[PDB]
Design a protein around this nucleic acid. Structure first.
Ligand SMILES: [K+]
Ligand SMILES: [K+]
Ligand SMILES: [K+]
Ligand SMILES: [Mg+2]
Ligand SMILES: [Mg+2]
Length: 136
RNA sequence: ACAU
DNA sequence: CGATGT
């Protein structure tokens, strides 16, 4: 502890897992929604959590912001650190879009730099992350 | 077991 | 109850 209020918080939302995936990023302090991705017909929770972090990195870099990013996903934080999303989702025609976006996010990480700290949101101590979809 |  | 991940 405690919370770094000057930060961006991201989270996935889904209808099924695998299922329809979306994500958004919010100002941790105010809850203002700063970006939201159009729903992707089939993906996993972790692919969406990964895309949300990478989108946050790109969003902050474009704006010359040094704010950290909070995610509640141990998995996605590791995938970003590794620059590799180790998803089990079948690659087929139905999953082509999510896998294209994941491939492109990895490619961005491999061609750009950033100093953005990627921090674990401590849900057990602080409650749900401010970007949560409220579906659980 | 832990994190979603 | 089901699923995705380390
Ligand atoms: K939720
Ligand atoms: K959670
Ligand atoms: K499990
Ligand atoms: Mg989450
Ligand atoms: Mg959530």
């Amino acid at each position: 502890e405690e919370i770094i209020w000057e930060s961006l918080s991201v989270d996935v939302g889904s209808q099924g897992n695998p299922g329809i995936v979306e994500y958004k990023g919010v100002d941790t302090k105010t809850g203002e929604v700063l970006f939201e991705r159009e729903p992707i017909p089939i993906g996993t929770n972790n692919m969406g959590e990964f895309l949300a972090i990478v989108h946050g990195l790109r969003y902050l870099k474009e704006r010359n912001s040094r704010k950290p990013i909070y995610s509640d996903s141990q998995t996605a934080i590791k995938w970003v650190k590794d620059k590799k999303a180790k998803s089990t989702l079948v690659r087929n025609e139905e999953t082509a879009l999510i896998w294209k976006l994941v491939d492109e996010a990895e490619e961005w990480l491999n061609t750009h730099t950033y100093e953005t700290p990627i921090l674990k949101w401590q849900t057990d101590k602080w409650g749900e992350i401010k970007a949560d979809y409220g579906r659980k």
